[PDB]
């Protein structure tokens, strides 16, 4: 009996530190993305990651449910949450752009621990683990409908940890900021950030360690929170961001 | 001349004591409700609060612009925002009760300062307030939909904060709890929070000052930001909750 | 007639603070270093005929002496100051360390320590401390005044879960970039509006592109002061223009 | 080959499951206490903890030195501060007990970490952990003095995180409450907070997951966070409290 995780949108931003450090722990990792309703696309993933299972399901009733039938329960779910950041003054969005972020930042997780919480509430065991965003922590201006739906992310962990205690479920929310992720254009892709001088310049000065954050990193911790090894720390926003933000200092001083 | 204030669901929250206080400091308080669809309702508030202008327009866009045809321009925003507190477990709700509370807390914010945005960015003048929530600074179990909503809306004033300040514009959110709202279900009618004894005992556990919050101190607040006086604390979230919340302490030690 | 005591008067936070809750109709109190000579204390009190200024120096004497001659103090602001000296950990002395959290969390603490018993008995009053908004966002290299100043906004907000009881707020006012005029602590006329580097730098640093202002942080002083608005005990007021403004990705303007 | 670490206080609050779990790791662990002034006492935790290393040095300058000279290097420390919570009105206090708070919470870590800065600067190695407390998140009234200073040390180490970061040298708060302290008084020990009715159904009433925390899961979080495996998490201040704190809710609904 191997326990069973969930991580959606396997692809992009945490999804492959997730999967990848979940199999090395021992958990069969069920993967959702957008990309496996084509079964050459699930296939091709299946054939690079062995030790990962596809899932073709979309929806989070039918994606649960699936996951649940083929392997007998989901003892872990990671809702790795992605949506295009797209920066406008706040005039020049649509209303709808906004109800887009929410809809794929807040209301996603939410539908999919509405479909999983009752199967974890009854055996008294779980882990949910929301990806959201360290944008909250430090918004750049003109992101106002990503930064505020991610935020409301936040306090949907923070807020379900309280009453999933009782059940013996921990609740996290991980928010990244400057997290390579790789291929995968959410959020911060090795071109250009790890290619272009100007890019480069810009995390260096940004964040306290002055580089990217690791998939490795991002999986280490998704692993241990996911291993009961510390539910003690139920209902916390982690922010994984190198120390970002590092703030303006006063004319003079140093780099 | 005169400024102009918007008001929302002028009935409820903290609509009274934002729209009672921004009259007497003189400004022309243009009012929304959803009863003042019917003419008779309209009518009716216009006779009792004759310093008030009850609007008949419900939705965001068509509000502003009502505003702005009537009075010349909108000079300050108060989205006073309502939507009834569900409690349920994670999984009672439905996936529909979570996006009612982001359209009502999230997206009608975003919609009216959309709307609003563009007319105070040219003047380069203008105050937003929206009404929101101290439920995030401290959540209740089983509120998972209205109080990460109403994080969201925190989130999306300290955003637009970022923006708008180039701009000479603030944005503040007030977030209460433990608001007297006299007549009005949302959030603490008169009965039962000053009339049953229970009701009483649990304002005076949980709030530092061991009492409800007044209309008058909401107003108080939302006028003086609203006068330009201090304009240097946009971005401000405050906990307008009398000291919620009180942190039980360890057996032995009195009330 | 109520009665506030301000102290730093000269520096920070203090001259918005006792203009305006003299404006307001208290008897204003102002406690400063500079007090303890005759000719400064004159000095003021000729320049500010609306002002009383004490030469009164330690917590427990500053207090005694308003009570004695005003008969109670209604209103508290502990405008606390300390000189932001930037280092690596490791090149401070520990006695650095001290030296701030003497004078930003226990002056602070020895202060309401001091008056606490006389608002509580009457079951009125109003505590404000003016801290820093340097918690909100760390500059590298300052850490013995930023976590000094971090602890002074925690006092506030642990007070004001007792004294609400004897109906008492209690905030922290949490300032950055306000124009102190001719005051060092912290932003003097010169060179934060004289000099390009400095204008510019606090054109990038706060949203609204400007210092605050003595009268915004005296305004908000004296709301707080007028038992208008109680019901935000607890507080922490970030008054820093919007600061921090977080570097946006290459390509993206000003 | 083996990493070093120092944990302080040994016999209290975290510091005995920071130090074993720090050992099985494999580090070298230097162990700190006010009792090992007492060469029979410093001699007993040796016999009974054969794989720890106790020190007798009790100032912070003459601590990291005798560790580095009797091991090499200090690699990892772990500030595990202890005070003893006093609670009072605040003009019951001596402004000394103030003062006495400061010293212990806020003094001392800064302390150690002027002391050992250099070492781990030159290498551009080395990993800071304080254990701090969760009670600024939540404070009781009538404890200002310890919760205040604890907040100092919270934003101590954050501060500390953004110019360590460029050295390679992540800085850690944890903050715990209802953390069980076994035998030491520092804070829960298994009596009361175990073995009395009262403080069972307290600890059941305010932290989601209805129990006390235990020191292995602290020591897991301390032994993760010096592995190096998760450095992105650097100017965290972690949260173990179990999901402490819970807010009381209103009359009528259940427990
Ligand atoms: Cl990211
Ligand atoms: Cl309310
Ligand atoms: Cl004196
Ligand atoms: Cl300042
Ligand atoms: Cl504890
Ligand atoms: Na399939
Ligand atoms: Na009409
Ligand atoms: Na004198
Ligand atoms: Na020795």
Same mark, same amino acid.
């Given at each position: 009996?191997?326990?069973?995780?969930?991580?959606?949108?396997?692809?992009?931003?945490?999804?492959?530190?997730?999967?990848?450090?979940?199999?090395?722990?021992?958990?069969?990792?069920?993967?959702?993305?957008?990309?496996?309703?084509?079964?050459?696309?699930?296939?091709?993933?299946?054939?690079?990651?062995?030790?990962?299972?596809?899932?073709?399901?979309?929806?989070?009733?039918?994606?649960?449910?699936?996951?649940?039938?083929?392997?007998?329960?989901?003892?872990?779910?990671?809702?790795?949450?992605? /949506?295009? #950041?797209?920066?406008?003054?706040?005039?020049?969005?649509?209303?709808?752009?906004?109800?887009?972020? %929410?809809? +794929? !930042? @807040?209301?996603?997780?939410?539908?999919?621990?509405?479909?999983?919480?009752?199967?974890?509430?009854?055996?008294?065991?779980?882990?949910?683990?929301?990806?959201?965003?360290?944008?909250?922590?430090?918004?750049?201006?003109?992101?106002?409908?990503?930064?505020?739906?991610?935020?409301?992310?936040?306090?949907?962990?923070?807020?379900?940890?309280?009453?999933?205690?009782?059940?013996?479920?921990?609740?996290?929310?991980?928010?990244?900021?400057?997290?390579?992720?790789?291929?995968?254009?959410? /959020?911060? #892709?090795?071109?250009?950030?790890?290619?272009?001088?100007?890019?480069?310049?810009?995390?260096?000065? %940004?964040? +306290? !360690? @002055?580089?990217?954050?690791?998939?490795?990193?991002?999986?280490?911790?998704?692993?241990?929170?996911?291993?009961?090894?510390?539910?003690?720390?139920?209902?916390?926003?982690?922010?994984?961001?190198?120390?970002?933000?590092?703030?303006?200092?006063?004319?003079?001083?140093?780099?």
């Amino acid at each position: 009996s191997h326990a069973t995780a969930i991580v959606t949108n396997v692809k992009h931003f945490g999804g492959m530190g997730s999967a990848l450090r979940l199999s090395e722990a021992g958990h069969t990792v069920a993967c959702h993305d957008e990309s496996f309703k084509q079964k050459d696309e699930l296939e091709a993933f299946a054939e690079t990651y062995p030790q990962l299972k596809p899932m073709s399901e979309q929806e989070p009733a039918e994606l649960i449910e699936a996951v649940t039938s083929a392997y007998g329960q989901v003892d872990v779910l990671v809702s790795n949450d992605i /949506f295009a #950041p797209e920066f406008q003054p706040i005039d020049k969005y649509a209303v709808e752009d906004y109800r887009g972020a %929410v809809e +794929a !930042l @807040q209301i996603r997780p939410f539908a999919l621990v509405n479909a999983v919480a009752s199967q974890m509430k009854k055996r008294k065991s779980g882990h949910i683990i929301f990806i959201t965003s360290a944008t909250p922590f430090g918004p750049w201006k003109e992101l106002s409908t990503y930064t505020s739906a991610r935020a409301g992310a936040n306090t949907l962990a923070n807020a379900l940890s309280k009453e999933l205690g009782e059940y013996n479920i921990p609740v996290f929310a991980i928010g990244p900021n400057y997290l390579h992720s790789e291929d995968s254009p959410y /959020f911060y #892709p090795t071109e250009p950030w790890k290619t272009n001088p100007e890019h480069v310049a810009h995390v260096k000065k %940004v964040t +306290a !360690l @002055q580089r990217l954050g690791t998939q490795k990193e991002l999986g280490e911790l998704v692993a241990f929170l996911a291993s009961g090894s510390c539910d003690y720390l139920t209902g916390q926003v982690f922010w994984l961001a190198g120390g970002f933000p590092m703030i303006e200092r006063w004319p003079g001083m140093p780099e």
